[PDB]
Amino acid sequence: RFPALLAELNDLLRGELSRLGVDPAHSLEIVVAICKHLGGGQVYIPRGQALDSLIRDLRIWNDFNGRNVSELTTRYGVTFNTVYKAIRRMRRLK
Ligand SMILES: [Pt+2]
Ligand SMILES: [Pt+2]
């Protein structure tokens, strides 16, 4: 699909680019980096809930510094249990 998927990936990127200001011409520069470091074979991109659960945990575990779980439960409005599960998740993914 890539002639078409990469084409879509490009338009989406230059939209979000100009959206954040950045000149919409650096999109192609970004599509190249994604494909260059991520490419090789095929990957299954999650759709709904699986994706949404991951985005939540990614946001949480990226704010974790090793000792701020209390701060994370307050910033994200979720329970200690939810935060610890996200953490255990960065850890498990190899
Ligand atoms: Pt790489
Ligand atoms: Pt880590």
Short mmCIF file of N, CA and C and ligand atoms in Angstrom, two decimals:
data_model
loop_
_atom_site.label_atom_id
_atom_site.label_comp_id
_atom_site.label_asym_id
_atom_site.label_seq_id
_atom_site.Cartn_x
_atom_site.Cartn_y
_atom_site.Cartn_z
N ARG A 1 0.78 -1.27 0.00
CA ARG A 1 0.00 0.00 0.00
C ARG A 1 0.80 1.30 0.00
N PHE A 2 1.99 1.23 0.56
CA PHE A 2 2.86 2.41 0.67
C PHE A 2 2.84 3.53 -0.40
N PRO A 3 2.64 3.22 -1.71
CA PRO A 3 2.65 4.45 -2.54
C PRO A 3 1.48 5.32 -2.08
N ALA A 4 0.44 4.64 -1.63
CA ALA A 4 -0.77 5.29 -1.16
C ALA A 4 -0.69 5.62 0.33
N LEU A 5 -0.17 4.69 1.12
CA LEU A 5 -0.05 4.96 2.55
C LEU A 5 0.98 6.06 2.79
N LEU A 6 2.13 5.97 2.13
CA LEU A 6 3.14 7.00 2.32
C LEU A 6 2.62 8.34 1.82
N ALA A 7 1.75 8.30 0.81
CA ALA A 7 1.17 9.52 0.27
C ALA A 7 0.27 10.14 1.33
N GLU A 8 -0.55 9.31 1.97
CA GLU A 8 -1.44 9.80 3.02
C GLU A 8 -0.61 10.31 4.19
N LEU A 9 0.37 9.51 4.58
CA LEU A 9 1.24 9.87 5.69
C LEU A 9 1.86 11.25 5.48
N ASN A 10 2.13 11.58 4.22
CA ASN A 10 2.74 12.86 3.86
C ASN A 10 1.76 14.03 4.06
N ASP A 11 0.56 13.91 3.51
CA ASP A 11 -0.43 14.98 3.66
C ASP A 11 -0.78 15.21 5.12
N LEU A 12 -0.98 14.12 5.86
CA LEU A 12 -1.31 14.23 7.28
C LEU A 12 -0.22 14.99 8.00
N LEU A 13 1.03 14.63 7.71
CA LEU A 13 2.19 15.26 8.34
C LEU A 13 2.35 16.75 8.06
N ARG A 14 2.12 17.17 6.82
CA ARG A 14 2.29 18.58 6.51
C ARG A 14 1.12 19.39 7.07
N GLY A 15 0.03 18.70 7.39
CA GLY A 15 -1.11 19.38 7.97
C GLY A 15 -0.75 19.69 9.41
N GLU A 16 -0.36 18.65 10.14
CA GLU A 16 0.03 18.79 11.53
C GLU A 16 1.25 19.69 11.66
N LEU A 17 2.05 19.76 10.60
CA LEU A 17 3.25 20.60 10.61
C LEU A 17 2.84 22.06 10.65
N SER A 18 2.17 22.51 9.60
CA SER A 18 1.72 23.89 9.52
C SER A 18 0.82 24.18 10.72
N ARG A 19 0.11 23.16 11.18
CA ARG A 19 -0.77 23.31 12.34
C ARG A 19 0.07 23.78 13.51
N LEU A 20 1.27 23.21 13.64
CA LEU A 20 2.19 23.57 14.70
C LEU A 20 3.11 24.67 14.19
N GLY A 21 2.79 25.20 13.01
CA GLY A 21 3.59 26.26 12.42
C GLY A 21 4.57 25.78 11.37
N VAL A 22 5.56 25.00 11.81
CA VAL A 22 6.60 24.46 10.93
C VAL A 22 6.22 24.41 9.46
N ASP A 23 7.11 24.91 8.61
CA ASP A 23 6.88 24.91 7.16
C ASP A 23 6.50 23.51 6.68
N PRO A 24 5.32 23.38 6.05
CA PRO A 24 4.75 22.14 5.52
C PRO A 24 5.63 21.40 4.51
N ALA A 25 6.84 21.91 4.29
CA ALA A 25 7.75 21.28 3.34
C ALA A 25 8.67 20.26 4.01
N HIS A 26 8.75 20.32 5.34
CA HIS A 26 9.60 19.40 6.08
C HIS A 26 8.89 18.08 6.34
N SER A 27 7.68 17.94 5.81
CA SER A 27 6.91 16.73 6.00
C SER A 27 7.66 15.55 5.41
N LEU A 28 8.01 15.66 4.14
CA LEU A 28 8.73 14.60 3.45
C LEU A 28 9.98 14.19 4.21
N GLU A 29 10.64 15.16 4.84
CA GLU A 29 11.84 14.89 5.62
C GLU A 29 11.47 13.95 6.78
N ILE A 30 10.26 14.12 7.31
CA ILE A 30 9.78 13.30 8.42
C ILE A 30 9.32 11.92 7.97
N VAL A 31 8.62 11.86 6.83
CA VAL A 31 8.16 10.57 6.34
C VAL A 31 9.36 9.67 6.05
N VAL A 32 10.45 10.28 5.60
CA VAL A 32 11.66 9.52 5.28
C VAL A 32 12.27 8.89 6.53
N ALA A 33 12.32 9.67 7.61
CA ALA A 33 12.88 9.21 8.88
C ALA A 33 12.04 8.08 9.47
N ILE A 34 10.72 8.23 9.42
CA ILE A 34 9.85 7.19 9.94
C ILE A 34 10.13 5.90 9.20
N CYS A 35 10.00 5.94 7.88
CA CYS A 35 10.22 4.76 7.05
C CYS A 35 11.64 4.19 7.15
N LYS A 36 12.62 5.07 7.27
CA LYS A 36 14.01 4.63 7.36
C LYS A 36 14.30 3.85 8.65
N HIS A 37 13.83 4.34 9.79
CA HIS A 37 14.09 3.66 11.06
C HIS A 37 13.07 2.61 11.47
N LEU A 38 11.88 2.71 10.90
CA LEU A 38 10.80 1.80 11.22
C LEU A 38 10.59 0.72 10.17
N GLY A 39 10.94 1.06 8.93
CA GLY A 39 10.78 0.14 7.82
C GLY A 39 11.55 -1.17 7.89
N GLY A 40 11.40 -1.95 6.82
CA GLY A 40 12.06 -3.23 6.75
C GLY A 40 11.00 -4.27 6.45
N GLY A 41 10.00 -4.36 7.32
CA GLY A 41 8.93 -5.32 7.14
C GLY A 41 7.57 -4.68 7.35
N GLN A 42 6.64 -5.41 7.95
CA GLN A 42 5.31 -4.87 8.18
C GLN A 42 4.95 -4.82 9.66
N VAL A 43 4.12 -3.85 10.02
CA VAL A 43 3.72 -3.71 11.42
C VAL A 43 2.20 -3.60 11.50
N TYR A 44 1.63 -4.11 12.58
CA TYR A 44 0.19 -4.03 12.75
C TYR A 44 -0.15 -2.81 13.61
N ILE A 45 -0.78 -1.82 13.00
CA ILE A 45 -1.15 -0.61 13.71
C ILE A 45 -2.53 -0.74 14.33
N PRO A 46 -2.60 -0.76 15.67
CA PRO A 46 -3.85 -0.88 16.43
C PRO A 46 -4.91 0.14 16.02
N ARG A 47 -6.17 -0.19 16.26
CA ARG A 47 -7.26 0.71 15.88
C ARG A 47 -7.81 1.55 17.04
N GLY A 48 -8.87 1.05 17.67
CA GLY A 48 -9.52 1.77 18.75
C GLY A 48 -8.99 1.69 20.17
N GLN A 49 -9.67 0.91 21.01
CA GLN A 49 -9.30 0.77 22.42
C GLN A 49 -7.85 0.38 22.70
N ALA A 50 -7.31 -0.58 21.96
CA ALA A 50 -5.93 -1.00 22.17
C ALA A 50 -5.00 0.19 21.99
N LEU A 51 -5.29 0.98 20.97
CA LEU A 51 -4.50 2.17 20.68
C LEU A 51 -4.67 3.18 21.81
N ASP A 52 -5.92 3.45 22.17
CA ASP A 52 -6.22 4.42 23.22
C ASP A 52 -5.60 4.07 24.59
N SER A 53 -5.54 2.78 24.93
CA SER A 53 -4.93 2.36 26.21
C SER A 53 -3.43 2.61 26.19
N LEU A 54 -2.83 2.40 25.03
CA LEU A 54 -1.40 2.58 24.84
C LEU A 54 -1.02 4.06 24.89
N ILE A 55 -1.81 4.91 24.24
CA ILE A 55 -1.54 6.34 24.25
C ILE A 55 -1.54 6.82 25.71
N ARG A 56 -2.52 6.37 26.49
CA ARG A 56 -2.61 6.74 27.92
C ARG A 56 -1.34 6.33 28.67
N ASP A 57 -0.97 5.06 28.56
CA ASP A 57 0.22 4.56 29.26
C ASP A 57 1.52 5.19 28.79
N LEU A 58 1.60 5.50 27.50
CA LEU A 58 2.79 6.12 26.95
C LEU A 58 2.93 7.51 27.58
N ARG A 59 1.82 8.23 27.63
CA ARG A 59 1.83 9.57 28.21
C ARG A 59 2.26 9.47 29.67
N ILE A 60 1.70 8.50 30.39
CA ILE A 60 2.05 8.34 31.80
C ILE A 60 3.50 7.91 32.01
N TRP A 61 3.92 6.81 31.38
CA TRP A 61 5.28 6.36 31.61
C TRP A 61 6.37 7.31 31.12
N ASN A 62 6.02 8.27 30.26
CA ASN A 62 7.01 9.24 29.79
C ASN A 62 7.23 10.35 30.82
N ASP A 63 6.29 10.46 31.76
CA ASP A 63 6.37 11.46 32.82
C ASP A 63 6.99 10.84 34.08
N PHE A 64 7.12 9.52 34.10
CA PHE A 64 7.68 8.82 35.25
C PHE A 64 9.18 9.06 35.32
N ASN A 65 9.68 9.37 36.51
CA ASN A 65 11.10 9.62 36.67
C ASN A 65 11.71 8.66 37.69
N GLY A 66 10.92 7.68 38.12
CA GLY A 66 11.43 6.73 39.08
C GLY A 66 10.89 6.91 40.49
N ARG A 67 10.31 8.07 40.79
CA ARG A 67 9.81 8.30 42.14
C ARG A 67 8.63 9.26 42.21
N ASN A 68 7.96 9.50 41.09
CA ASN A 68 6.87 10.46 41.11
C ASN A 68 5.48 9.89 40.83
N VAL A 69 5.23 8.65 41.22
CA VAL A 69 3.93 8.05 40.97
C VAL A 69 2.80 8.87 41.58
N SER A 70 3.03 9.42 42.77
CA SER A 70 2.03 10.24 43.44
C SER A 70 1.68 11.46 42.59
N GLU A 71 2.71 12.05 41.99
CA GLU A 71 2.52 13.21 41.12
C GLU A 71 1.75 12.79 39.86
N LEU A 72 2.06 11.61 39.33
CA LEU A 72 1.38 11.14 38.13
C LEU A 72 -0.11 10.86 38.35
N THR A 73 -0.48 10.33 39.52
CA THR A 73 -1.90 10.07 39.75
C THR A 73 -2.66 11.39 39.82
N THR A 74 -2.00 12.43 40.29
CA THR A 74 -2.64 13.75 40.42
C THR A 74 -2.74 14.47 39.07
N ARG A 75 -1.67 14.39 38.28
CA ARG A 75 -1.68 15.04 36.98
C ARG A 75 -2.61 14.36 35.98
N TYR A 76 -2.70 13.04 36.03
CA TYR A 76 -3.55 12.35 35.07
C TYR A 76 -4.93 11.94 35.56
N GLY A 77 -5.22 12.22 36.82
CA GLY A 77 -6.53 11.93 37.38
C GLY A 77 -6.97 10.48 37.41
N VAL A 78 -6.01 9.58 37.54
CA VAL A 78 -6.29 8.15 37.59
C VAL A 78 -5.67 7.58 38.86
N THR A 79 -6.03 6.34 39.15
CA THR A 79 -5.57 5.68 40.35
C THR A 79 -4.12 5.22 40.32
N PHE A 80 -3.59 4.95 41.51
CA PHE A 80 -2.23 4.46 41.65
C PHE A 80 -2.11 3.16 40.84
N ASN A 81 -3.13 2.31 40.94
CA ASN A 81 -3.14 1.04 40.23
C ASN A 81 -2.97 1.26 38.72
N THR A 82 -3.71 2.22 38.16
CA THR A 82 -3.60 2.51 36.73
C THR A 82 -2.19 2.99 36.37
N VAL A 83 -1.63 3.88 37.19
CA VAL A 83 -0.28 4.38 36.92
C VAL A 83 0.78 3.27 37.02
N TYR A 84 0.68 2.43 38.04
CA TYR A 84 1.66 1.36 38.19
C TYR A 84 1.60 0.34 37.04
N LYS A 85 0.41 0.14 36.49
CA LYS A 85 0.27 -0.81 35.38
C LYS A 85 0.94 -0.24 34.13
N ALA A 86 0.87 1.07 33.96
CA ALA A 86 1.51 1.73 32.81
C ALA A 86 3.02 1.58 32.95
N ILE A 87 3.52 1.82 34.16
CA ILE A 87 4.95 1.72 34.46
C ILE A 87 5.42 0.29 34.19
N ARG A 88 4.71 -0.69 34.76
CA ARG A 88 5.08 -2.08 34.57
C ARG A 88 5.12 -2.41 33.09
N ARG A 89 4.41 -1.61 32.30
CA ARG A 89 4.35 -1.79 30.86
C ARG A 89 5.61 -1.26 30.14
N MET A 90 6.15 -0.08 30.50
CA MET A 90 7.39 0.40 29.82
C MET A 90 8.35 -0.75 30.07
N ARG A 91 8.50 -1.09 31.35
CA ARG A 91 9.41 -2.14 31.80
C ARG A 91 9.32 -3.46 31.06
N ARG A 92 8.11 -3.95 30.82
CA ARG A 92 7.95 -5.22 30.14
C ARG A 92 8.30 -5.18 28.66
N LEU A 93 7.94 -4.11 27.97
CA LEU A 93 8.24 -4.04 26.54
C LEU A 93 9.74 -4.03 26.27
N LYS A 94 10.19 -5.04 25.53
CA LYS A 94 11.60 -5.15 25.19
C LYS A 94 11.91 -4.35 23.93
PT PT B 1 16.63 2.50 13.58
PT PT B 2 12.78 2.24 31.67
#
